[PDB]
């Protein structure tokens, strides 16, 4: 049974370690701070005396630290013990930093996978949990069931180590922009005395609509062609302006909605008024 | 049995008329420019010679004229023939416009419903389609089947006529902001060569996350209290800055992300650094 090591025992590291134990993998864990975790040891993890001892206990070493820099600082003293093992970094980092980490791993003879966790800690280890991995293909294929244990929707996205961070930041762009809109829509409703939980049941219809548009928008963006008949951007800009003005009249900050409107307007200025919302990608790509 | 009239045969007016015909209602249609209704007439709609003739043919009168001034210009000459009928304005614009239109209707003794269509035209008439209505409750109760014909999830949201626009614009605030993030996320991935249709299958994970957060966020905002168990807003603002930095480096317009960030930073400056994302509502409500 493949021995696995987890370095970094913040909440995400602890969740990863816990998923491995539920799967039945022998797990060794190490943290800079003594007080961290110890629930895992009760469930059978071995706490290691030193990062080197933790690396030596693992065929796969998972690092989940604060910053890319912190991971290099922990890892670079233990490079010698990592040689010939599999290193997976799920630390949130930029594509540039993942690729630099890949160069470092190559210089030390480490098969390296850059990973990203896309779900909250609570769902880590569940059949529907999504993680991305990029880098050494043999490392992923050899330890696929380990990675399936951390989340059943684990996906390898390619050999370029930066791609895990690319998928992560692209999905996070969508997520946090939608959470900003979610808070704003509720604030707009509250300005007229409507409780947020009165709006919430209805937002489900727009959840179903967004799921449909995910697939449609991707395929327009890949085609490079945006089709007008289902909806026209010119009229969509006018609809968004009604939101912008009502929220502004009510004293809300409207910087997000105005920014949404300007990008779409710019795509109209570039000639896409009869096209669908997908054409707004041209405003995002060619700001004035 | 109930005769229905549709005034204005743009795409939305046409979809509404088609939905009433699918349900078997006797439908009379009118447009200011000729030849809009020929497909509708072939399926049994009656074209009216004049707006006054059209109004007189329908117990329920749906007005789907996009331009406010143009719609008022048709309606005020037929005010006397609208007496004793039910007038439904299916338009977006603002709650204030609905309240103004309601005052006009009240002086003329017209029972008035302000309506908002929350789904694309192709979905109008579907059992799943969501439409909002506000205004005269006895009018809505008497013609509920006609409104259910237009969309099976038709919902009456209250007697103040402006409330349909409140629910509509609030939901649209979330929807169009999320569509902006969706295009922007796809654009970010494409700068690194990732096709949009490679990301699209994964976005389902973030959609179901959003569905849960819709309720959690609503309850926080109604409570006026935003504890964050695992995430500090201060740390969430830093995460947002890494998306912003990656997209800005790649040459994208990042207006929306910067605005999202600025509203959240304002909430930190207002004292919510230790709170959850729901506390960003304080930033939206008290811009610097």
């Amino acid at each position: 049974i493949t021995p696995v090591t987890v370095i970094g025992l913040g909440a995400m590291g602890r969740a990863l370690a816990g998923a491995l134990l539920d799967a039945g993998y022998p797990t060794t864990v190490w943290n800079r701070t003594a007080g961290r975790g110890e629930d895992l040891v009760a469930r059978g993890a071995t706490l290691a005396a030193s990062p080197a001892e933790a690396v030596r206990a693992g065929e796969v070493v998972l690092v989940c630290v604060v910053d890319y820099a912190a991971s290099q600082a922990i890892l670079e003293p233990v490079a010698a013990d990592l040689a010939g093992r599999v290193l997976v970094n799920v630390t949130s980092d930029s594509p540039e930093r993942a690729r630099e980490a890949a160069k470092w791993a190559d210089g030390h003879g480490i098969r390296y996978l850059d990973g990203a966790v896309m779900i909250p800690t609570v769902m880590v280890g569940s059949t529907d949990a999504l993680l991305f991995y990029a880098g050494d293909k043999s490392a992923y294929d050899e330890h696929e069931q380990v990675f399936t244990s951390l989340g059943g929707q684990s996906a390898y996205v390619g050999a370029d180590h930066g791609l895990a961070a690319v998928y992560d930041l692209s999905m996070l762009d969508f997520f946090w922009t939608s959470m900003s809109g979610l808070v704003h829509g509720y604030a707009l409703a509250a300005k007229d005395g409507v409780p947020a939980t009165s709006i919430a049941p209805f937002l489900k219809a727009h959840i179903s609509l967004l799921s449909l548009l995910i697939e449609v928008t991707a395929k327009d963006l890949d085609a490079g062609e945006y089709p007008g008949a289902e909806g026209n951007l010119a009229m969509e800009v006018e609809g968004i302006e009604h939101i912008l003005h009502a929220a502004e009249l009510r004293g809300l900050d409207v910087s997000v909605l105005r920014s949404v409107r300007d990008v779409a307007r710019r795509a109209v200025d570039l000639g896409h008024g009869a096209d669908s919302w997908s054409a707004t990608v041209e405003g995002a790509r060619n700001p004035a």
Side-chain angles (χ1 to χ4, degrees), chain A residues 7-13 31 63-66 68-71 73-74 89-94:
Chain A
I7 306 203
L9 289 188
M12 186 46 74
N31 191 234
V63 172
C64 195
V65 297
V66 51
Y68 39 83
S71 162
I74 307 191
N89 223 310
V90 278
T91 293
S92 325
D93 61 354
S94 94

Side-chain angles (χ1 to χ4, degrees), chain A residues 173-218 220-224 226-229 231-234 236-237 239-262:
Chain A
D173 179 8
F174 168 67
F175 176 75
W176 284 113
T177 308
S178 310
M179 293 295 294
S180 174
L182 173 63
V183 166
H184 208 269
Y186 284 151
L188 182 58
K191 285 296 175 154
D192 279 80
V194 179
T197 41
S198 306
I199 306 284
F202 294 106
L203 283 177
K204 303 335 181 93
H206 274 5
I207 286 284
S208 323
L209 187 55
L210 276 148
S211 315
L212 290 158
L213 298 201
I214 276 160
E215 290 288 4
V216 170
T217 307
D220 305 338
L221 261 55
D222 286 346
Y226 325 109
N232 84 85
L233 184 49
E236 290 165 345
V237 169
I240 291 159
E241 269 161 6
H242 301 327
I243 323 173
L244 160 76
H245 292 129
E248 199 164 47
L249 179 149
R250 281 147 179 89
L252 290 175
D253 181 302
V254 285
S255 58
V256 173
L257 273 168
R258 200 161 258 131
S259 292
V260 165
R261 198 271 326 263
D262 294 346

Side-chain angles (χ1 to χ4, degrees), chain A residues 149-193:
Chain A
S149 290
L150 308 173
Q153 305 304 118
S154 292
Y156 172 85
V157 293
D160 162 26
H161 298 255
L163 290 185
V166 170
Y167 278 67
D168 175 41
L169 288 165
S170 304
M171 298 187 43
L172 284 186
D173 179 8
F174 168 67
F175 176 75
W176 284 113
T177 308
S178 310
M179 293 295 294
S180 174
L182 173 63
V183 166
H184 208 269
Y186 284 151
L188 182 58
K191 285 296 175 154
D192 279 80

Side-chain angles (χ1 to χ4, degrees), chain A residues 18-31 33-35:
Chain A
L20 297 160
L21 314 173
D22 316 331
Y25 288 105
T27 310
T28 301
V29 286
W30 179 90
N31 191 234
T33 287

Side-chain angles (χ1 to χ4, degrees), chain A residues 33 131 155 272:
Chain A
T33 287
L131 288 88
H272 299 280

